[PDB]
Amino acid sequence: MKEFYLTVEQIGDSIFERYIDSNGRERTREVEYKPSLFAHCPESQATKYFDIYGKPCTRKLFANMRDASQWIKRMEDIGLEALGMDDFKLAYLSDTYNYEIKYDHTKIRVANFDIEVTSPDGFPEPSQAKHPIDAITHYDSIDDRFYVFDLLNSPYGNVEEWSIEIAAKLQEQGGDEVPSEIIDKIIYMPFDNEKELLMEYLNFWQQKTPVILTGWNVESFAIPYVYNRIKNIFGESTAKRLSPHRKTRVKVIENMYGSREIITLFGISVLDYIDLYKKFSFTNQPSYSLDYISEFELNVGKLKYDGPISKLRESNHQRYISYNIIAVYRVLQIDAKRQFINLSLDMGYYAKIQIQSVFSPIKTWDAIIFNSLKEQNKVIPQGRSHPVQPYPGAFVKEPIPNRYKYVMSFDLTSAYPSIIRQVNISPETIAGTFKVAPLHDYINAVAERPSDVYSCSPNGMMYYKDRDGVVPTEITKVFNQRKEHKGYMLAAQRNGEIIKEALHNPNLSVDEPLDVDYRFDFSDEIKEKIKKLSAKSLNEMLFRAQRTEVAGMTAQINRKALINGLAGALGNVWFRYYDLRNATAITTFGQMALQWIERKVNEYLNEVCGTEGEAFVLYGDTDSIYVSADKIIDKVGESKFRDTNHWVDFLDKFARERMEPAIDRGFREMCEYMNNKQHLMFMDREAIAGPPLGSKGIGGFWTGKKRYALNVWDMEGTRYAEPKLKIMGLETQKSSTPKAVQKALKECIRRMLQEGEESLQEYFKEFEKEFRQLNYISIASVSSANNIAKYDVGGFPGPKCPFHIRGILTYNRAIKGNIDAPQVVEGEKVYVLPLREGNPFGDKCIAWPSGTEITDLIKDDVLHWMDYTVLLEKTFIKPLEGFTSAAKLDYEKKASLFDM
Template sequence: MFVEKSGYIVSRHTKEVNGRIEMSLFIKTPEGTVKVVPDKQHSVFFTDAAPDSFPTGLSGVSVSSTHFKSFENHPVTLIQSQSLTIHQQMVKLAKANGHSVFEEDVKPHNRYLMERNIRGAVRFIGIPDTSQQTFQQARLIVGDYLPNWLIWSLDIETSVTHNKLLSIGVTSNDLRVCLIVSEQHIESDEIHCFATEKEMLLAFIAFVKKHSPDIFIGWNLISFDLHFIDKRCQVLGIRPAFGHHGESWNIRASENQGRYFISIPGRVALDGITLLKVGGYHFESYSLNNVSKEILDDGKLLHGGERWQEIERLHQEDLQAFVAYNLQDCDLVLRIFEKLQLIELQQTRVDLTGIPFEQPGGSVASFENLYIPRLHKAGWVAPAWRDEEFVASPGGFVMSSIPGLYKNVLVFDFKSLYPSIIRTFYVDPLARVTATINESGNASGVNPMVPGFLGAQFNRHMAILPELIRELAEAREGAKKDDNSILSYAIKIIMNSFYGVLGSNVCRFYHAELASSITMRGHELLARAKGWLEESGTKVIYGDTDSLFVTLDDTHSDPLKTGEELCQKINKCLVDWCRDYANLESHLELEFECVYERFFMPTIRGQEEGSKKRYAGRSNGQLVFKGLEAARSDWTPFARQFQRTLFEKVFNDENPVAFIQGTIDKLRLGEYDDQLIYSKQLSRPLDSYTKNKPPHVRAAALVDQKRAESGLPLEFNKGRKRVYYLYQISGVIPYETAEDLVNLDYEHYIEKQLQPIAESILPFFGVSMDSLLSQQISLL
């Protein structure tokens, strides 16, 4: 008997069972998470081979003609298979006979949901088993269920010395538990002790099954915590039955072995670092201690490169303090997720695009989920993967700047420039190929072809993306009116990702003409806007991607009013130009962003030519630094604060010479010693630096050499780790404790940190850094 329920998809899976496909969806319902097995279990792909080119009577295979066409304008055949093995065999057969295959890599569960426009919330009917936990022969449609997630923040502590688990901490809004391997027998609601690591892991599996969390969150959760648990399960012969119904999870490594991905039936694992980056947050360091200090004004109870020694000591000598440290890390992650609404952001992306909940990135998957169903509706299949040379599109427009110290600089930005270009100029994969084959007629009397770049044309009657962007843009405006910042931001991320997807050869829709028709149109539009602004009597001193910086002369007494008037004029010019260019409706919009009361555009260091992507300004009393040392994490805190103070004085019309001289004196007296520590990220494993070894690499090598001599695991052998170092008179050394702040090479910091910053501004005051330093030497 069929039963109807509402819910939200937690995870989706396809596997081979007894020679047949088993597709399963784990769906959270008001009564709990259930396993739903849809009907129509088959895999699908298309090929340009004719139906009669395949053997007849193949078991488990359906071959049929379709009304769909390929991007080469050829009819395609639909191949449906009941087995993943047969699916792969049929793909190989088509390719072996010289035919192209299309959409062969789309997973059955993703296709099933995509074709039904199902993303997160669903309604389904199915036949339940006696436990009411599994529903067979299910049919699903779009729903509106809003889940109340049970979220666990998870963190483990390990023994570096023995490479074993010491504890597993979990916190949620109503739970605080630490499972710990210890000979002590402290039993409380918060602490559960176990004699062996294996006993602890088995207890944790049972604990997960009992409480059934929906989402695990953590810091470097998958690549460290869950991966470490998985390795220990393998060593101890334990099946990692952390899924719903006790199903095993599956962890796999990325191709470069730097990251790991996990699939947990009925549960989701989300890493805080990854979600922050997807959400557009930027930090000097993504360590939990640094992020929690910036976001929460709180931090870890222990931190620093050698904290593992203190962790092992606490585990042996002070179990209460050890547990407090473990659970504090869980609490920090939970609070960061709650404050930044990271779960809500991820769920909103799922609701908008249908990507799997556990996939925090997925720009290509988001695009294909939105585009392919519309493509099918238009009668086409997605293009085959092409083995061709990648041609990078030109980057964003960046004009040479006019260096100087300015007053009243206006900044104009194109609102969502690249999505607006796609919408206005019909930049679209299907529009490009149908323009080539002249698929559409000219019944309206308007030329259907819109010029692109690199020889591209776009058929305005066959474009999918412009309509998709219109829907998203209208939804974003509605979200703004409703003050729904999460929805508005999620839509912005999606729209802005379309250009990158079309210009990336990891997307099947990639073509050089697509991305270039976006970026090169951007170049043209900024150049035209620059011309229109200068025709209005202003001077454009800089332009970058979607922004223009304009300086006014003294005749403009009200910069704000002038900015608004110029903005209206340029938008009118854009409307007129688009109409005259190709009878297009302009969706381009220039916005007046702000006025910098004071503004500084530097030269390229050591040259007279103006710099790019580097400036400083003051707007409404706030200092803004772009690309300069004050905004760069690889410069010392001393240099960054020096630059901020320097420009506070310059923008207040103070002569900075005395301040610079005083800073040099204080530096040599040791007053800034604790601000002289460099910080730089290793971009790859330490042993891959063979020829050029910059200072942070040399410092990291010294740390690992010392650890190897002590028989300890290496710290930098996997790369992607931040190195802290400083310069003593003897040279570069790693910074580990305050005891390293001795014999510092102050002349190095003057030459490499203070002098480049001061030299950028001193010429405006008729002074050179050489003359200042020579005065200092004479005084000494």
């Protein structure tokens, strides 16, 4: 097989590389790599190396990497550009793997671990590591085993061995319900003392050295804690055995009341699953505890126990160990669903970077572009410093707040990347500038044509047309990858809808789910068999379809994020190819495109309806337009439709057969006007929205920019079994809005759009009556808590103190002199509740760590003094009043003559 790297490091003048050899074995080597860098040279001097602008360069081969670094410094002292890849391990990978990498994940050691540490005096600071590590569960992907290291004797109590038999039993039998599918995969090792546990752990780690190291909060807790505890017991050299090259670096970002640090283990790639989740999931969660995310992702219940975690080991060591194991398994289950490890490997190997560099789109693109240019003996420019400067972005149209009955939306496929490709925007393709007219003049096609030679953006930039830039070339490659995975995602979605329909009529039989590939639209044969299936089999198929859709979503959305990150990187001062001319060329062309096509669509539709000056485009954000379809429906007349699906078909057909060609014609003209390299503005129908045929539903409404709701029947070609709400910006979509309030507001919106005013009034009246029974957590607001110290003045609110910070200070006073009470962690999220006048907490609100129950000391009092009136008015009534006045409806019945 083809060799591939596992990890790469620079240590002094050596490269340290772990890799898989041509026989599939893991190997490690130290290489005295001799890097090259480049200097401009005179024209009359034969060379094969040129900078991206066509200037000749000479290669400088250095005796070692330190020599290369020192040369860079001296070139700065002289005042001359030192060209080439200054990150020498990326140059090493490029030289060593000069082909597209095929990797075999089954040869990559992926380790997932979690530790337990009993602490009677609060949170056990990793930087101090003053308490014994009393459990480690370490899952190894190559062995497919959970290795359990259990401390039986500690100064905080001596315990009995964990029992695998009890662990397997149902909770109703007194057991821990450790999932049966992992019971046989557990290798349990009890230890008489902490020193032998850790020594055996290090020996094990030597045998089975992680390549990818993950788990939950491992980078900020488990790794630094394990490292520091070993350092404190045995000394530094023993702690450094966690690195296969025995090298580590401390970081220390720190607060001022807590120390903290991260530990870099050379030759390991740490991908903390919490950071993977935050980067790749596109959720914003009220809490990031493993319990909370596990419940969200997997619908598995909380791991329940009595008493604080600080007494769990002594009271119930059996459960204590079982929960440690289950915690490790939960992360694996999340990854089986979300496939973020697979994603990271794919993207890392594609770019030829350290896998952990996938967190940095700047590093990722710098490596992609370097590899691409190196292929042609081209030499990358030196990175420079630039002052940070603001620049303009997208256009957003101000909507008229209103209900909108029938709506069709359209938006550009991969807008910014498509602009880059169409215009040919790249560091090396800049051809000059032209004299700019106001944007309005380009939008209305009255400005003079910018160029008869070059490809233009309305910000005044011109680009060569003879050849593609490296940015367009490389962005196209990831775009095509994106497009393939989205294809699979959407087929899985459409397949899911077929299953939902069939579920209306399940058959009474004993049968099996079909062995099918959900990434491809079901054939006629598959459809027929499905209509014959039982409810059990259909549900299993729906589950599998939905898992396939999620896998597709991960692959496509993060590739979309990578290419959009390239457009954004052009406006970050740390990117090698930072250029505000190029970043603004993209954003300014975008503003033009939206307003240009708005004009075109209005003109087209006024023509087809025989009107003048009518606005059909009611809204638009960045690269999208929302078209009012009322007149189109009315042209045929509502009474002509058999059912909802009949008009959805009609609008779908109108969008595809009339509007899209009109849209395409408008954009081709714009492409010619701008003399662009290639027409790539593709504005496809997104949504078809409206009320259910014959109902009093209003279909949709806007309150303002980036705030709207639509009742959608068809999304990008997926025809839903049941209508789905598309809600953007409104309170239902914000992590800060209480959970039960999100749910209530969503139902109010559902009723508005699908059923009408009276249905809304029914629900409101009931919600208002019953809501005081809602669990306090479900009605708590949520906020991030930054700068707690800044606003703390002897335990009281300082000037301009934010509402959520005030709550935290209230909490801090109420728990003072208690090392057991959970502390609020700077920068993490809190639940927030308003408090009634004259409460014992002596302020207007209280806040506590999110995803948790408030500590028992104050729980009863918080419940007693919670201000339900303020809660209701602030989180529910106020947003609802905004929705209903926008939509011209009342949430409460107004008096009328009939009352008599």
